[PDB]
Amino acid sequence: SMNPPPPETSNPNKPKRQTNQLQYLLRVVLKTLWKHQFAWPFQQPVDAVKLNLPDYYKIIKTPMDMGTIKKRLENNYYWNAQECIQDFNTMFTNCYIYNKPGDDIVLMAEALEKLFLQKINELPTEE
């Protein structure tokens, strides 16, 4: 089953801002998760063809991945840190919806999420 167009990483008519919190989300939260040993399946949109997951986009109607989030952060797509945090939460939730508890990909998601919650705990107050 085939791949949809990926989520946008630009949108000229969407409002956006730069904040120290969004910068922390790029410099710290994304960079740290990206370098983890379990990050690779989350670094790009799910390719349902290559991975032989033909049901994926029958079940996941709001897909999200850290490649997308990385480009959104780099391109100043967001209005505030909350919009970005939702994207990470969408990514994790999709994983938990599509797969079974304790599947390898779910353990990977859980490790990344643990780390995510740790880094978000030190999100600086908006300056």
Ligand X SMILES: CCn1cnc2c1c(=O)[nH]c(=O)n2Cc1ccc(Cl)cc1
Q: Which amino acid is at 87?
A: D
- Contact map string, positions 67 to 106, toward ligand X, x by CB under 6 A: ----------------------------x--xx----xx-
Q: Which of 30, 42, 70, 73 binds ligand X (CB under 6 A)?
A: 42
The amino acid at residue 78 is: Y
Distance between CA atoms of 35 and 31, rounded to whole angstroms? 6
Nearer to ligand X, 38 or 79 (CB): 38
CA distances from 16 to 56, 83, 88, 104 (A): 31, 10, 18, 36
Instruction: Quote the least distance from Cβ 53 to ligand X, whole Å.
Output: 6
The nearest distance, CB 41 to ligand X, in angstroms, is 4
Check binding of 41 to ligand X (CB under 6 A). Answer: yes
CA pair distance 29, 14, nearest whole angstrom: 23
What b/e sequence results for 92-111 when a residue is b if at least 16 CB atoms lie within 10 Å of its CB, and e otherwise? bbbbeebbeeeeeebebbbe
Candidates 2-10, 41-49, 72-80, 119-127 — which segment interacts with ligand X by CB under 6 A? Answer: 41-49
Binding site for ligand X (CB under 6 A): 41-42, 46, 51, 53, 95, 98-99, 104-105
